[PDB]
């Protein structure tokens, strides 16, 4: 009736996916044994959306995952639910990553992505029907950007009438193993802006900025970082995986949120900023704990309350609270802003109060929405590009395999078009 696949990638996308399904099975508890731990027996359809049929009421994901560094996945296979996966995900080798964008983009990945497309093709039809693709994809490594871009391309020529869910980690000046990542960014979203349906500007140095400064956490590690981002995107996709009365479907989300179908970079924030470490243990009521919904300095993107131009919002609650206070809070935060009074955006009243039982909390407060601060994120990406490229530095690492300069030139033409269009929107 409604099925979503499980394709992952990268060396960081795979581990954030491991944490993702760990924390979204935290409220499900689906055992890997076969004792049939039912979360809710009326939710056979809403376990079948993600955990698909393999036996009699044994529901497992469409578990296929690929990378050339097997140590990370062999480490995360010994997790809480790290063994409830089909013996078909193990499609890989030992060629190495090396933070090489060309080998994931052009040379090494072209001999291995055929097996991945074959297994997703032979796994897609083994259900009622196909509805959605999803991917936890990263840019911190080298291979992941290239093979994710080529996989999105191949699913464009192979499955055009299907949505794909593309998580995308933005580069970071604060945590970085190698620094070539401006080149890993300027020719990754060069075609991703016209290849996929919806994307995410989950940042990394704004994310570390809110992890360090505005939370005062003594854990600058990938552990609590993955905990926070997995909780945030779990609160995001809880709406899509639990359709109570609202939280419209896949193309329906693309219908009401995407004008000018390149401007599909919505920024997922989260209100209470609960974190393993310093914790606040009161029942989160609506107004004074959903007051962290509108503040632009409290999300996974570098923004500004006055230097910001929103044109869509979304809020999917989880507690059994009322909606009058939600509506008056929305009225205040939507009538307060002078720059928000533009000729566009007549109606974005989509807000959910669905009774979904959470993992450690009892409610939630999620933000999903576009802005023009993604333009200044791409502006600092562009200034890193000018720091790295204006003397053609470090291009000998990558030009030997299959690349040249004119792909970068058309990428910069697309960046100039994006900057010009978003500046036109800012002064419209």
């Amino acid at each position: 009736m409604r099925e979503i696949v499980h394709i992952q990638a990268g060396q960081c996308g795979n581990q954030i996916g491991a944490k993702f399904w760990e924390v979204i099975s935290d409220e499900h508890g689906i055992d890997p044994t076969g004792s049939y731990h039912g979360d809710s027996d009326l939710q056979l359809e809403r376990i079948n959306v993600y955990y698909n049929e393999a036996a009699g009421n044994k529901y497992v994901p469409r578990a296929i995952l690929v990378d050339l560094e097997p140590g990370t996945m062999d480490s995360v296979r010994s997790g809480p639910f790290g063994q409830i996966f089909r013996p078909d995900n193990f499609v890989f080798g030992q060629s190495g990553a090396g933070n090489n964008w060309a080998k994931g983009h052009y040379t090494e990945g072209a001999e291995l992505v055929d097996s991945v497309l074959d297994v997703v093709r032979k796994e897609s039809e083994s259900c009622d029907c196909l509805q959605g693709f999803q991917l936890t994809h990263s840019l911190g490594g080298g291979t992941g950007s290239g093979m994710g871009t080529l996989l999105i391309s191949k699913i464009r020529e192979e499955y055009p009438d299907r949505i794909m869910n593309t998580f995308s980690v933005v580069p970071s000046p604060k945590v970085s193993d190698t620094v070539v990542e401006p080149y890993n960014a300027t020719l990754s979203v060069h075609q991703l802006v016209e290849n996929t349906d919806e994307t995410y500007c989950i940042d990394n140095e704004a994310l570390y900025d809110i992890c360090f400064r505005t939370l005062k956490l003594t854990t600058p590690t990938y552990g609590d970082l993955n905990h926070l981002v997995s909780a945030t995107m779990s609160g995001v996709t809880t709406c899509l995986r639990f359709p109570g009365q609202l939280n419209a479907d896949l193309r329906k989300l693309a219908v009401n949120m995407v004008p000018f179908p390149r401007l599909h970079f919505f920024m997922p924030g989260f209100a209470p900023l609960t974190s393993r470490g310093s914790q606040q243990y009161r029942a989160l009521t609506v107004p004074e704990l959903t007051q962290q919904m509108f503040d632009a300095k409290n999300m996974m993107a570098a923004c500004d309350p006055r230097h910001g131009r929103y044109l869509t919002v979304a809020a999917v609650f989880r507690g059994r609270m009322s909606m009058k206070e939600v509506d008056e809070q929305m009225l205040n935060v939507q009538n307060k802003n002078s720059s928000y009074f533009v000729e566009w955006i007549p109606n974005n009243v989509k807000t959910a109060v669905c009774d979904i039982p959470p993992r450690g909390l009892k409610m939630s407060a999620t933000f999903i929405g576009n802005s023009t601060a993604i333009q200044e994120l791409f502006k600092r990406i562009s200034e890193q590009f000018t720091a790295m490229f204006r003397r053609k530095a470090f291009l000998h690492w990558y030009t030997g395999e299959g690349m040249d300069e004119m792909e970068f030139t058309e990428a910069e033409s697309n960046m100039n078009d994006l900057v010009s269009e978003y500046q036109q929107y800012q002064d419209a």
Binding site: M1, E45, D128, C129, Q131, Q245, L246, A248, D249, L250, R251, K252, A254, V255, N256, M257, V258, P259, F260, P261, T312, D327, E343, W344, I345, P346, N347, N348, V349, K350
Partner: protein
């Protein structure tokens, strides 16, 4: 006195099965098949209990059509309070729906399902020859909605000659809505399905919101309340055909009484003597307040000022049930002294209609025992602003060319949107040219 109704969209099927459950509960059509008042199984066909057909050995079924591309809606209907006596052979649904738009369900993916439901319509059209129009349930963006109707009204007006029909357009409410592009599908539905129509009336969910939260003091905006209220209203509308009384005139008589023009086409359904468990307890019912509370702004489906709202017609419907004596007393107690602002160069004859044999009130709902009905089907020439506000929002959002790219590659062109704007501007400016009072 025979008609078969079709229903499209998720909310269309919701109001359809709610209203049919109310019908079967108020005629005594039990889930045992037969009605226990007589010895005919399944149902009956005598004069006004005529919503059935002899399918089996006297077996009668509540003939209706429930269509939606999303497949789980008919499953959650079929496990409802009227479980197994819906038809096990015409509940036709698709596999994947259009998912809250217009173009895909109309042009591309519905093009292989239009002929299947057309063949079903032909198979039910080989049945009993009673025909007095249609009853089409749809919305603007609920389920498939506009995608089926925009094609099937043209198909009905070309394939089935020039036969009369009637449709139900659920006017949306942005405070409880689920989309943003509702101006686009609203303007497209309004240029398509209204010029190929015979009768229609638009029901506003925001009007239900106003009469619930602002006039009844209840605190629950759920679609179950909307379904029960629509069941009550459409049951009161259909009760002329459903029960015979003093002026038991047909729906064909109503549609040949109401509509003046192809463009001047829509009524203002005036029924707000609002009731629940609160506003039905120990009150007294009279024929003055329920009739004096009609022209006021906070009683209307579409908002209009009473002095600025000009009644081309002032047709009325009564559920009666006591006497026609007090109705023909209120024709002088209320109806005769009506010097209210009217339309120039048109007759000023007020119409009343009483239909006896009470439809039973909703069991297990909220309202207590109530008697009267003031379903005054007037019309208003100043509902041009009620779509001119949507045209203004569509102008302020359409110059930005928003959501155009989802409506380009499915067959149409920008000339279609320009034609839709032209059609609604033509309707509005025709109302301020000759509809609103002129010389």
């Amino acid at each position: 006195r025979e008609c078969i109704s079709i229903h499209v969209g998720q909310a269309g099927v919701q109001i359809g099965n709610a209203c049919w459950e109310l019908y079967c509960l108020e005629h005594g059509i039990q889930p045992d098949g037969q009605m226990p008042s007589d010895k005919t199984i399944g149902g009956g066909d005598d004069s006004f209990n005529t919503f059935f057909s002899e399918t089996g050995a006297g077996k009668h079924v509540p003939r209706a059509v429930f269509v939606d591309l999303e497949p789980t809606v008919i499953d959650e209907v079929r496990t409802g309070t009227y479980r197994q006596l819906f038809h096990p052979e015409q509940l036709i649904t698709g596999k994947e729906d259009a998912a809250n738009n217009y173009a895909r369900g109309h042009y591309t993916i519905g093009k292989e399902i239009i002929d299947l439901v057309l063949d079903r319509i032909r198979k039910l059209a080989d049945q009993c020859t009673g025909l007095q129009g249609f009853s089409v349930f749809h919305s603007f963006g609920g389920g498939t909605g506009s995608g089926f109707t925009s094609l099937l009204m043209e198909r009905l007006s070309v394939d089935y000659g020039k036969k009369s029909k009637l449709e139900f357009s659920i006017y949306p409410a942005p405070q409880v809505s689920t989309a943003v592009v509702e101006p686009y599908n609203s303007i497209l539905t309004t240029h398509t399905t209204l010029e190929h129509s015979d009768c229609a009336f638009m029901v506003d969910n925001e009007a239900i919101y106003d009469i619930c939260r602002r006039n009844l003091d209840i605190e629950r905006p759920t679609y179950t309340n909307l379904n029960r209220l629509i069941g009550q209203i459409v049951s009161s509308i259909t009760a002329s055909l459903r029960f015979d009384g003093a002026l038991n005139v047909d729906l064909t008589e109503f549609q040949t009484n109401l509509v003046p023009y192809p463009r001047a086409h829509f009524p203002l359904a005036t029924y707000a003597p609002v009731i629940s468990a609160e506003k039905a307890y120990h009150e007294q019912l009279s024929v003055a307040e329920i009739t004096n509370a009609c022209f006021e702004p906070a009683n209307q489906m579409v908002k209009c000022d009473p002095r600025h709202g000009k009644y081309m017609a002032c047709c009325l419907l009564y559920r009666g049930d006591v006497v026609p004596k007090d109705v023909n007393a209120a024709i002088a107690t209320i109806k005769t002294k009506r010097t209210i602002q009217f339309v120039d160069w048109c007759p000023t004859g007020f119409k009343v209609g009483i239909n006896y044999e009470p439809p039973t009130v909703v069991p297990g709902g909220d309202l207590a025992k109530v008697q009267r009905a003031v379903c005054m089907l007037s019309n208003t020439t100043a509902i041009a602003e009620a779509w001119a506000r949507l045209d203004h929002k569509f102008d302020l959002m359409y110059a930005k060319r928003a959501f155009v790219h989802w409506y380009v590659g499915e067959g149409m062109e920008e000339g279609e949107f320009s034609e839709a704007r032209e059609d609604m501007a033509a309707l509005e400016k025709d109302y301020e040219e000759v509809g609103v009072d002129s010389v």
